[PDB]
Structure formats: structure tokens, C-alpha cells
């Protein structure tokens, strides 16, 4: 089954759906509080359709339209194979989102032309200032908070060497590396 939703949100007392799939006969729609909907099994490819609301043909503003040689205007929807697998649909949708984001950046050297965010307290818990019980292996540390990972910590430059450290995850385990670099 390839379910396709036909939803009319514009109110009215009776709404019917007509299109190429039913040979342009009026299909009564189920009403919710507002929505009038039908979910049909449709083959992939192009389908033309129109809503009939309270005795009047009315187009759907949400979908594109097509005019025939004799002047009738219908909505058309496109049923694509990518619509029936959710991750294929999301991949298509994420491509359409990157496309609009092009018409609205690289690395560069130009500077920029409202206070800074307050520093969050978690970054002031310094894992190398914490003491460990003397009974355990001096290389063991407490489990870090996920939020302090990858941030740089340091000691004041003294005697020409700078010491840097940070905590990085490998799989489910955590390593705090110190580096002693002469300046």
C-alpha cells in the first residue's frame, strides 16, 4: 500500500475529493474538528485532483496547479518512491532544505562587523584540581560531565613551558591528556 493524504483545512459543511484516480467523481471526506481528510492508495507518478466544497470547485493553495487545453485548473501531486520509506523521505527533505539555504559559507580571514553569554558553572569544575582517594591508582580520575569534554584547560606559563590539558572520549571511556610544551 502507498497511502496518500488528501486534507482540506479550509472549513465548509461538506467537502468531496475528485481527481484522475476516481475518474472525477465526488468522494465524501471524513471531518475532524476542522480537517476534511481521505487517505488513498495511489500508484507513483502524477495525479490531478480538485476539492469540491459546498457545491463549488475549489483549488488547494498548498499544492501546484495545472491548466488543461480546455481551461480546467487542477492541483497536481507527485507520488514518488522516496515518499514511502521514512529515511528516504527525510533525505529528500533535507536536500530541499539545503537548497533553500543556498539562495538566502567558506572559511575566510575577514573580521566581523550585546554582551557575551555568561559562563556556565560546569566549566569551572576542574577535574585535575580534584583530589582522589590515596588508596587508588594515581592515574584514575572521576567520571567527567559530558559538558566539559573537549574544552581546554591550562596552567600559568612558568619557566618557559606551557601545560595544556583536555578530556576526550574514546568510545565509552575518557582520557585527560596533559601536554608539556616549551614556549
Amino acid at each position: 500500500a502507498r497511502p496518500t493524504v488528501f486534507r482540506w483545512t479550509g472549513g465548509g459543511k461538506e467537502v468531496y475529493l475528485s481527481g484522475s484516480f476516481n475518474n472525477w467523481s465526488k468522494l465524501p471526506l471524513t471531518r475532524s474538528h476542522n480537517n476534511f481528510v481521505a487517505i488513498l492508495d495511489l500508484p507513483e507518478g502524477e495525479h490531478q485532483y480538485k476539492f469540491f466544497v459546498d457545491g463549488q470547485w475549489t483549488h488547494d493553495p498548498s499544492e501546484p496547479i495545472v491548466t488543461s487545453q480546455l481551461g480546467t485548473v487542477n492541483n497536481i501531486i507527485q507520488v514518488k518512491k522516496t515518499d514511502f520509506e521514512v529515511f528516504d523521505a527525510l533525505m529528500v527533505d533535507s536536500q530541499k532544505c539545503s537548497d533553500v539555504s543556498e539562495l538566502s559559507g567558506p572559511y575566510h580571514q575577514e573580521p566581523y562587523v550585546r554582551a557575551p553569554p555568561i559562563l556556565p558553572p560546569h566549566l569551572l569544575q576542574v577535574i585535575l584540581n580534584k583530589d582522589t582517594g590515596i588508596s587508588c591508582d594515581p592515574a584514575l580520575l572521576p567520571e567527567p560531565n559530558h559538558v566539559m569534554l573537549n574544552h581546554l584547560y591550562a596552567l600559568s606559563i612558568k619557566d618557559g613551558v606551557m601545560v595544556l590539558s583536555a578530556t576526550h572520549r574514546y568510545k565509552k571511556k575518557y582520557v585527560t591528556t596533559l601536554l608539556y610544551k616549551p614556549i
Partner: protein, 298 residues
């Protein structure tokens, strides 16, 4: 048998702590500064990063400290100039010399069998675990860490038959040419014994030959912590007096004692070797984590 397939089943990753700290030295760091950084950070070994080669080129351990002291020390009346002037890079140029001695490491996804194999083949006590995908060093693997890990699982498998055999019956450890120092032996002589016979610790014995103390390579770094490294004429006894109030004595074992007994004693005491003695405490040999891990992979 069964402990061998256990080692082959587990990657080194499983031995890595959940959270641990690791100290790296750039090769251009002054070697004296680096030994101090070991003391202040509480770790006994550091990986060595060469920022020109952009590669890990080796490890700095306490044995480097012992090697620098034994070679360049002259008298308590003069400074040891090469310890103050040497960068790690220049010291390695002097020490390494002819030996190829490239960096020995192991992947996190390699088996424990491969770790013990690497430790024994290269005769080292520290195998750095480098992740090949990020190039990062993760942890410094040791014999203690492998044995304690195995001890956790001995209840999970049928226990072999040799675990109940005595140390005498299995001939595990070194029973001949034991390197020892007397109670009055100066530190500098002990350092020389460390360099000549490559061994992790020297039992300290009285005049009649029974062990009153033990001088590990680890205890040498107290020379760095107390900055007493400039006088090596003092005795091993005076070098260990800082330890006297919390020292409970030398962990020993007899030859009639079972190998499982030995393993539990070492894992619980977290030291690298036991001193095998007789009734009267006179030393008949050494049994080390080297011997024990080697025997379990044979």
C-alpha cells in the same frame, strides 16, 4: 590453556579505565623539568611527542632517571650538569645510540595476548595504547593492570590444575644470581646494579642475608621529589627512611605456596614482585609479574 584463550578474547580496550589522566612531554622539554612533572602529576611514565616529526617517538620512565644519574653523577660536591642542560631529545640521542629502539605500542582493538606478547618480546614494563584512527594515546598498559584484570575473571572459567601447584613444583621465577644490595649500600651502587642487570627491584638484606627492605626503581623517584638526587652517596636505607612510618615490611612467599596463593598476594598488594624466602627470611629468589604472565601464556 584456558587463560590463554581469555587473553586472546579481550581487546586491550577492556583494560582501559573509564577515566584516567595521561601526561605527554614534547621532546624539546628539559629532562629535569620532565622528571619533576612526573612527581607533581603522580605518574611514573609519559609518552614522548616530537612536534617536528608529528609522531610519538617513545616513552619517558623512571629508568631514564636512573640512567642519567648513574652516568653523569660524580660527587655530592658538584652539580650534575647534564641533568640540568639536557633536553629529552638530546638525552635520547646519547642514551639510544646504536639501538634502533623504535616506539612499541598497541592498538585498543588488539588482544590482551598481543599486549603480554609485546611486553615480553621487547622486555618493557609500559605499553602505550595508541588509537590508530585518531592517533591519540589512550593509556599506559602494565603487567599489574593485566594481572589484576585476569584476577577479576578467574571465577568465570574452570580453574586450571597448575593454579594449585606449588611455586617449587612449577619453577616460576628466578632462583639464581639474585641482584641484591646490603643495608649500607649507597644509592649510586644500586643505580649501577639497575643498569647492569636490568631488573625492577633490589631486595635489601642484612649481614646474614635475610631481607629487611626492598628498593624498587619506583623508590628512586623520591630522589626527584625530595631534590636529594645530588647526593647519591647515602645508603639505600637512608634513601627509604621517608617510607618508614607507613611501610609494613617486605611481601614474601615460600616455595611450597600455591601459584593461586601467589597471584592473589600480588594482585592484592599491587606490587610487581614477591621475594621468595626460606624459614629464616634469607632470600632464595624472586617471582615477578614478568614470570607469572609469561608462564600463563606458554
Amino acid at each position: 590453556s584456558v587463560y590463554t584463550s581469555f587473553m586472546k578474547s579481550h581487546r586491550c580496550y577492556d583494560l582501559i579505565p573509564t577515566s584516567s589522566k595521561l601526561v605527554v612531554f614534547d621532546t624539546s622539554l628539559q629532562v629535569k623539568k620532565a622528571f619533576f612533572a612526573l612527581v607533581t602529576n603522580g605518574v611514573r611514565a609519559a609518552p614522548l611527542w616530537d612536534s617536528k616529526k608529528q609522531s610519538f617517538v617513545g616513552m619517558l620512565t623512571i629508568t631514564d632517571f636512573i640512567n642519567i644519574l648513574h652516568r653523569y653523577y660524580k660527587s655530592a660536591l658538584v652539580q650534575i650538569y647534564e641533568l640540568e642542560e639536557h633536553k629529552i631529545e638530546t638525552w635520547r640521542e646519547v642514551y639510544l645510540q646504536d639501538s634502533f629502539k623504535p616506539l612499541v605500542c598497541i592498538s585498543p582493538n588488539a588482544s590482551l595476548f598481543d599486549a603480554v606478547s609485546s611486553l615480553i618480546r621487547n622486555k618493557i614494563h609500559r605499553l602505550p595504547v595508541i588509537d590508530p584512527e585518531s592517533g591519540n594515546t589512550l593509556y599506559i598498559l602494565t603487567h599489574k593492570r593485566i594481572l589484576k584484570f585476569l584476577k577479576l575473571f578467574i571465577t568465570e572459567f574452570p580453574k586450571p590444575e597448575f593454579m594449585s601447584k606449588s611455586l617449587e613444583e612449577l619453577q616460576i621465577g628466578t632462583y639464581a644470581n639474585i641482584a641484591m644490595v646490603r643495608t649500607t649500600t649507597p644509592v649510586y651502587v644500586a643505580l649501577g646494579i639497575f643498569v647492569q642487570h636490568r631488573v625492577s627491584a633490589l631486595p635489601v638484606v642484612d649481614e646474614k642475608g635475610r631481607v629487611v627492605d626492598i628498593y624498587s626503581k619506583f623508590d628512586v623517584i623520591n630522589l626527584a621529589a625530595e631534590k636529594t638526587y645530588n647526593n647519591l652517596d647515602v645508603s639505600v636505607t637512608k634513601a627509604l627512611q621517608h617510607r618508614s612510618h607507613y611501610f609494613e615490611g617486605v611481601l614474601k612467599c615460600y616455595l611450597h605456596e600455591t601459584l593461586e596463593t601467589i597471584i592473589n598476594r600480588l594482585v592484592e598488594a599491587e606490587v610487581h614482585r614477591l621475594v621468595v624466602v626460606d624459614e629464616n627470611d634469607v632470600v632464595k629468589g624472586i617471582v615477578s609479574l614478568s614470570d607469572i604472565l609469561q608462564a600463563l601464556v606458554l
